[PDB]
Structure formats: structure tokens, C-alpha cells
């Protein structure tokens, strides 16, 4: 068969600074080389591949908080995210 239950993640600079490591399906991470996107290793019946999907983040609209809050735009990944402090 030679069928995988894990994906081989190898991403890095062309110099050979790429880190190849196996992630079991169900693993998600952000694209390091590119802008930010969520690479979701999916197992579809007997097919196992990396699904290139975009990052999940909230709307840029201001969350409902009482006057006297501090709007804090702060996110870990490439997306819009502002919370009320």
C-alpha cells in the first residue's frame, strides 16, 4: 500500500533550512514561508494530504463592550482581530 496516516511537512528557505517532520492527520499550523494560512493535514477516506486553507479569525468590527473599554487590536497570525479590554 505505502499509504500514509501522517503528512511530511518540509518547509524552509531554498538554502536547505527546511525542517522535514511528520505530522499525523488532524494537525494544523500556519505557513512560515508565506503569509499566514492554516495548513490542515486531512485524511479523506484512503487519501491523506495537506489542505491549504486560510486562517480562522474574527471580524474587524468592534465587539460589544461597555463604554470605558480599550479596543486592543492584537493577533498572533496574519488576520484582523480587535478585542475590548
Curated annotation (Swiss-Prot):
<protein>
    <recommendedName>
        <fullName>von Willebrand factor</fullName>
    </recommendedName>
</protein>
<feature type="glycosylation site" description="N-linked (GlcNAc...) asparagine">
    <location>
        <position position="54"/>
    </location>
</feature>
<feature type="short sequence motif" description="Cell attachment site">
    <location>
        <begin position="15"/>
        <end position="17"/>
    </location>
</feature>
Amino acid at each position: 500500500g505505502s499509504m500514509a496516516s501522517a503528512c511530511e511537512v518540509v518547509t524552509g528557505s531554498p538554502r536547505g533550512d527546511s525542517q522535514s517532520s511528520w505530522k499525523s492527520v488532524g494537525s494544523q499550523w500556519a505557513s512560515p514561508e508565506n503569509p499566514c494560512l492554516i495548513n490542515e493535514c486531512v485524511r479523506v477516506k484512503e487519501e491523506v494530504f495537506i489542505q491549504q486553507r486560510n486562517v480562522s479569525c474574527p471580524q474587524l468590527e468592534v465587539p460589544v463592550c461597555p463604554s470605558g473599554f480599550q479596543l486592543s487590536c492584537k493577533t498572533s497570525a496574519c488576520c484582523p482581530s480587535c478585542r475590548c479590554e
